[PDB]
Amino acid sequence: EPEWTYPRLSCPGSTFQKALLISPHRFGETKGNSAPLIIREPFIACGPNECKHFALTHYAAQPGGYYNGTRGDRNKLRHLISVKLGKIPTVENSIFHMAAWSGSACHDGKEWTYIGVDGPDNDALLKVKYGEAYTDTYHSYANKLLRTQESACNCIGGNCYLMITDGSASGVSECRFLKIREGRIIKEIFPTGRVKHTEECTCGFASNKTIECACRDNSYTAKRPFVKLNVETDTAEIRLMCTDTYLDTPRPDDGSITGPCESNGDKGSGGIKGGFVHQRMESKIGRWYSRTMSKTERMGMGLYVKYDGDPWADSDALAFSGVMVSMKEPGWYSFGFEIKDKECDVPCIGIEMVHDGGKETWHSAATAIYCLMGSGQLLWDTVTGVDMAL
Amino acid sequence: EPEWTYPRLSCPGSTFQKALLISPHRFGETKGNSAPLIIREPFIACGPNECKHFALTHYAAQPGGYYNGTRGDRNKLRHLISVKLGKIPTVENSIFHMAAWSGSACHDGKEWTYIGVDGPDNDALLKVKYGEAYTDTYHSYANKLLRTQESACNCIGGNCYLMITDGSASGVSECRFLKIREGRIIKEIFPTGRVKHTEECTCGFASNKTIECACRDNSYTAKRPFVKLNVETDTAEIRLMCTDTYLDTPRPDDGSITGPCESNGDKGSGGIKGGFVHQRMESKIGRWYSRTMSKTERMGMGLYVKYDGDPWADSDALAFSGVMVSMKEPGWYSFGFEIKDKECDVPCIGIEMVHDGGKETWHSAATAIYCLMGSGQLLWDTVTGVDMAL
Amino acid sequence: EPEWTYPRLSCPGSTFQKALLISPHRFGETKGNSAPLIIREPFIACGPNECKHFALTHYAAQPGGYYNGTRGDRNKLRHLISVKLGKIPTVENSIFHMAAWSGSACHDGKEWTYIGVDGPDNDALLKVKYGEAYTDTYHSYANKLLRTQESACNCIGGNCYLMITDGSASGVSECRFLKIREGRIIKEIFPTGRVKHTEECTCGFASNKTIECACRDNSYTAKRPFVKLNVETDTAEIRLMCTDTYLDTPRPDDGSITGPCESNGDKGSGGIKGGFVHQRMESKIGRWYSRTMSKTERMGMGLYVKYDGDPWADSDALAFSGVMVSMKEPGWYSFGFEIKDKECDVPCIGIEMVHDGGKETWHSAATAIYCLMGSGQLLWDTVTGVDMAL
Amino acid sequence: EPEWTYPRLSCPGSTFQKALLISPHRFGETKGNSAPLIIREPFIACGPNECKHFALTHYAAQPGGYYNGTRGDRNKLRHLISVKLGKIPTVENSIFHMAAWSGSACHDGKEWTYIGVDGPDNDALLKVKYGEAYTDTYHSYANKLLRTQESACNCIGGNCYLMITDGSASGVSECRFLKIREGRIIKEIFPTGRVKHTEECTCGFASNKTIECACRDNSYTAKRPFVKLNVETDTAEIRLMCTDTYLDTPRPDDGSITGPCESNGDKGSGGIKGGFVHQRMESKIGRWYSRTMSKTERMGMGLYVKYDGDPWADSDALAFSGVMVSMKEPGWYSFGFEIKDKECDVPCIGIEMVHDGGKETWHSAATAIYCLMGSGQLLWDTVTGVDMAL
Ligand SMILES: *[C@@H]1O[C@H](CO)[C@@H](O[C@@H]2O[C@H](CO)[C@@H](O)[C@H](O)[C@H]2NC(C)=O)[C@H](O)[C@H]1NC(C)=O
Ligand SMILES: *[C@@H]1O[C@H](CO)[C@@H](O[C@@H]2O[C@H](CO)[C@@H](O)[C@H](O)[C@H]2NC(C)=O)[C@H](O)[C@H]1NC(C)=O
Ligand SMILES: *[C@@H]1O[C@H](CO)[C@@H](O[C@@H]2O[C@H](CO)[C@@H](O)[C@H](O)[C@H]2NC(C)=O)[C@H](O)[C@H]1NC(C)=O
Ligand SMILES: *[C@@H]1O[C@H](CO)[C@@H](O[C@@H]2O[C@H](CO)[C@@H](O)[C@H](O)[C@H]2NC(C)=O)[C@H](O)[C@H]1NC(C)=O
Ligand SMILES: *[C@@H]1O[C@H](CO)[C@@H](O)[C@H](O)[C@H]1NC(C)=O
Ligand SMILES: *[C@@H]1O[C@H](CO)[C@@H](O)[C@H](O)[C@H]1NC(C)=O
Ligand SMILES: *[C@H]1O[C@H](CO)[C@@H](O)[C@H](O)[C@H]1NC(C)=O
Ligand SMILES: *[C@H]1O[C@H](CO)[C@@H](O)[C@H](O)[C@H]1NC(C)=O
Ligand SMILES: [Ca+2]
Ligand SMILES: [Ca+2]
Ligand SMILES: [Ca+2]
Ligand SMILES: [Ca+2]
């Protein structure tokens, strides 16, 4: 007491449903009296007792006078913040963890590990925090743009596993994994296989033995690089997802990429972080994923699922499981996370819904949550409700 | 450590008194600096250590720019929120539990169960949350409009009981009860008797054996359907309240519905959720109710009591027990709840006091609280103090 | 664990010093973004682990549109609120305990007892709350204006003692004391002696055997009625303070009231709640008191002290101990309270500094605190810093 | 349960890195809805479970109407406030500890000791608070201007050590040390050596036996007086730092003060509080310092380190260890502090970054934090991001 946490069997269920919308800019009107933080790249991570809603803030509020620059990704002001999930992340509700323009976090059963990358592009620095204490750092190994998941890391028996990558956004970016224990990096993991470009991995436990991630290739393909990480041997291998249902944005028509599973295909350049989460059952594994409704634009978000098989080798289309966000609403980064029920884990997907009015106004996001619950089919979609002119 | 909660004997007392007003829009002036949430359908539920003040928000604040739509009931933005009772439910104080346009919640002695219905009208979805975890769902069975109590559910020995209903607002709505244990629906209960139309049940423990509810018939009668639910056999029966003191709004004159207790009578169309709470004594049960002072309008709120007898068979008027809200002030939904003292339970009735300026402006509500305390007669009424023009 | 608290010997020291200013209207400008609550009658009460700053709010903020009425004492909106001492009592920081236009509170070692009087003037009602639960009430016994201390009640071995009074503001008001245990009134105490008019008692422990109070006579004298309450026999006696240093406002010149100690003297009509607190030493008792610098107006506040003797019988002038508030700053109600150090009690006096611009604007107060600390003499005075035009 | 705290070996690491910015005035726009407090002289102190971010407020917010006076140092409104480190210090987040225009604070492993000086210049008063209780005071001994550290005090085994000083800002200010146990001054320590002028000491543990301080001489020299305080014998000695790298501002060129280590040299008038913190290793001690990048202005802040030797006798330059704040940004007071990891201590330096637009506008500050973490070289600087016109 407290004990290390481990992945458990998932809670019973067979469909996702609309759970919760965090839409702080519903309160950002000039007529209003609130101060929602301007953010992007939200994610959620849960421990034994609570869930935290994290994001990267531009250290500015709406309404405010610092909108200029909020459409960019990196600067000296960007910070990793969080609130307890369900609270509106305002100036006062939020806590500022560390300076960061790329982030992650995960609870190991005893304490929170927070991860923030900042610094100049060519020599950025990953900083590790354990509770209140800054405990370790890790250096840029390709001197291009060291960065991390923008979603939860994953802990088992006190060992927290984290994806990082470094390299050109439009070229080679070979990722690695760090094994972090009580805030200190105790092992590096160098993946083999199809390693050309892997970033913004969304990772979870397929079992006590294996972590899988669905990631983004920003240069070469609209198929998602798919990591299989063995946590017993601390080794990782990556291959493209073979599914005809290409999960990236942009992407070509489903199934249109000819040749073997590793064929890159058309419209590979560009990308989006994608949602992915495991439903671990006694004798099968459900893999849930999300992608935009639009093939080319960050609009809408659909849910998909496949049980079992080998994602590296199966071209089978994923089963379309419902519209979480209609194509009329923005659908940007998405991520997986799991909530800890008393005796089982509940898989969820979160969706960043960015308010984009161009660089001439503020630029921020709402966060929508869908979770496995009950049976049947997914019933309702999510709108942000935000009018950017107000 | 902790243990399951059970209803106890009520604390001594023989009259209700004005306890507390939560009037958030006292701070919603355009000249002000506050952000009260636009809400309706408030209710309260307490556990061993705290009381939570719940409501359904339209995800908008006053002052703000999203007033349009706030007089409606169902949309994709409504959420179940809560604060600790005594705190002003603002943007920042509140926590958002889940997407919902109909709600309930209750503590079982160990944890909170949160209940929220959303989805499309003809295929709505009840969602169950236990602590942070989404644990179960229940589907529309009439495919008309699945909905729930808008007040506390009732747990005993870990089993929480909840009214749901489904059907046309102007036709048949046959309710059901769900037995829910640690977030999971473990039994469905199909009531017998007068089941024609039952919705918005206000329920509480008459004893360790019986839950009773005072509900709303929105189409056929101004008498309230009265549920008796046997918690040992998990069976329920419903009959109209026979009291001449009809508790719904609108309603005809007291005693004017002639014939046997089950006669429906006139002005049965329409209705209102009604307050109801038990005073449990050693060999005597007090039943306390509230109804608007106006027969046709949602204005005022009066308190009533009757001891013992059979509400199904007794035509005698309930005893008038004080003006909680004068006819000059709004009196909308009302509900019962119990606060846990060290060794006994304190029964209370809460009153939604809606600020209604029609659809061209904001639409929200204050909450007044009356509790059993001391002896004598109820001494003072409650006003919201809100000028909607400000 | 936890244990009942008892008064202990005071911490070492021989002078008071400026400790803390709570001045919420420093943040109430129309140019600002805060919401301090409009309040009056502040007081402080401490338990084993924290101090709470209480006050009676008009349920309105500055800036705001409900200034009209905030110069009055009683209405249906007035509420007892509190924050942890050191926090600014704004809309969001404060917690609303109960409806009340007269108040008190005290911790008994295990739990908080909150006291609120509301209702119509001729039949007001004292309500008792223990933790979150409403537990008891007490009725108007003179049907004129039931009211209470506007400062902390006093608990010993679980027994909490409270002054109340009832009667005309300009006539007879015979006070009583209630003995309250775990939120329920278990004994009434009817004082003997000079009982004509006693209100707004400021009470504390002279020892484990005796509570003393310095109170206000609003009709007959500028001497303060002085209560001696024996907590072992639950009996109380009241006599006027004999000191030439008349502690009320208005008052005549010091020492100018001729005749025996009970002589009423000139300028008896009108009054002000006064500060009073005990310094309990091994073999002597220090009584600390406060009164306005002005003889006739609520301006300034000076500190006074006398060790030992019989306040009923000693005409000796109190030793003037320093200016806490200069005569250029407002000085309204004042009160005593004690902070619990690890092994000893620290005596303090708090001062209500009202911002009074007349009934045509807002009307509220800052709170200044002085405490026994170290030796020597009192060094610095307190200003509110507030410009009422902003 | 809990036990007294002691300094431990420092966590491993060999460079500082940018950790966290607290820039409250990023939200202080007139177009905004926030209320950052106007503050100066921030510092940080951590205990076993949390770090507190302290400052001295002028009891005014931005935006607000009390800017006039905020560029001054001493008045009757200044207060020591704090938030949990990571929270934005606003009107509502902050807590007000006591009236003070000079401050300090530290945790002893069981409880917080708060230190605040106020009163008139020629008769100021140091006040000690332990938890909620005011426990002790210490009087002006030179009757010129009693003042204290503006940074954390240092506790070991329950004994907390604190620098105080008193004297003319432009003449002799002979400091003293107070030994404080559970809020009470149990010993005075009179330093020997070069005691001419010592103020604003930044102190920390070199070991279980020795506290060291880097201080400010405001009249005679740009070398920092360096205190060595033996905590076992309770004796202290002071000598100028001999390093060519003069740490004060203003200062002449490095190494340009000729003669023996004790030579005062030129441009000694004026000064600035300087950062200083220990890296304790098994057989090696790291001393980390900060000084402005400008020789004459409060602009920029650079980090420096030197291992071992005797700071009193060593003229060798400290090693430059990175630009924490470039010369383009304000660099005012700086201070050291330590965060408690599970088993080791993390040394940090904080930097006050003042927003100075002169006396015709508001005057306040951000706080930048750098901590020991990882290896390599310090990688990124800090900006406030504040446009004072907004
Ligand atoms: C992963 O391993 C953990 C630890 O072995 C498994 O958790 C245990 O499950 C058993 C049976 O359910 C319990 O009796 C233990 O108390 C659990 N250990 C704990 C809580 O620390 C977990 O089930 C495994 N995950 C799987 C099999 O998916
Ligand atoms: C309902 O049943 C519960 C459980 O049997 C009763 O609670 C017990 O009350 C007795 C004293 O009356 C206590 O000594 C027990 O410790 C209680 N048990 C629990 C589990 O709380 C409860 O009193 C019953 N309620 C009514 C109204 O009779
Ligand atoms: C009032 O009575 C209480 C209870 O008898 C006294 O508190 C005790 O003091 C002794 C000696 O200081 C301790 O050993 C006990 O533990 C205390 N009892 C507690 C803490 O419950 C208290 O000193 C008395 N007040 C006086 C004498 O002024
Ligand atoms: C200063 O002294 C304390 C107390 O002796 C040291 O703390 C102990 O450290 C050992 C291991 O190094 C632990 O096993 C003990 O439990 C610790 N005791 C306490 C009371 O904390 C501390 O290490 C010393 N600091 C330095 C820098 O040597
Ligand atoms: C508010 O929204 C509704 C959509 O149902 C629309 O019909 C109505 O015109 C809107 N009101 C205004 C003022 O635009
Ligand atoms: C601010 O206050 C000072 C008092 O020291 C006064 O001299 C000055 O004129 C004031 N400024 C304004 C703009 O009134
Ligand atoms: C910010 O926007 C302004 C307005 O066009 C532009 O002039 C300026 O160059 C921009 N600066 C940055 C850093 O984006
Ligand atoms: C409030 O003030 C207005 C303005 O003079 C006055 O007309 C009205 O009678 C007042 N009402 C109350 C209740 O004080
Ligand atoms: Ca791509
Ligand atoms: Ca009806
Ligand atoms: Ca008088
Ligand atoms: Ca100098």
Numbering used by the authors:
A (entry chain B), B (entry chain A), C (entry chain B), D (entry chain A): 76 to 465
In the authors' words:
The neuraminidase inhibitors (NAIs) oseltamivir and zanamivir are the antiviral agents available in France to treat influenza A or B virus infections. The NA active site includes catalytic residues (R118, D151, R152, R224, E276, R292, R371, and Y406; N2 numbering) that interact directly with the sialic acid substrate and framework residues (E119, R156, W178, S179, D/N198, I222, E227, H274, E277, N294, and E425; N2 numbering) that stabilize the active site. NAs are divided into 3 phylogenic groups: influenza B viruses, group 1 (N1, N4, N5, and N8), and group 2 (N2, N3, N6, N7, and N9) from influenza A viruses.
We are the first to report influenza B viruses, isolated from an immunocompromised patient after prolonged oseltamivir treatment, with good fitness carrying a novel I221L substitution (B numbering) in NA that confers high-level resistance to oseltamivir. Sequencing of the NA gene in isolates revealed a unique mutation encoding an I221L substitution in NA at a level of 100% for isolates from a NPA obtained on D34 and a nasal swab specimen obtained on D40 and at a level of 80% for the isolate from a BAL obtained on D42. Analysis of HA and NA genes revealed that the only difference between oseltamivir-resistant and oseltamivir-susceptible isolates was the mutation conferring the I221L substitution in the NA gene. The Km revealed that the I221L NA variant had a 1.9 times lower affinity for the MUNANA substrate, and the Ki values for oseltamivir carboxylate and zanamivir showed affinities that were around 84 and 51 times lower, respectively, than that for wild-type NA. Moreover, the NA I221L substitution does not impair virus replicative fitness.
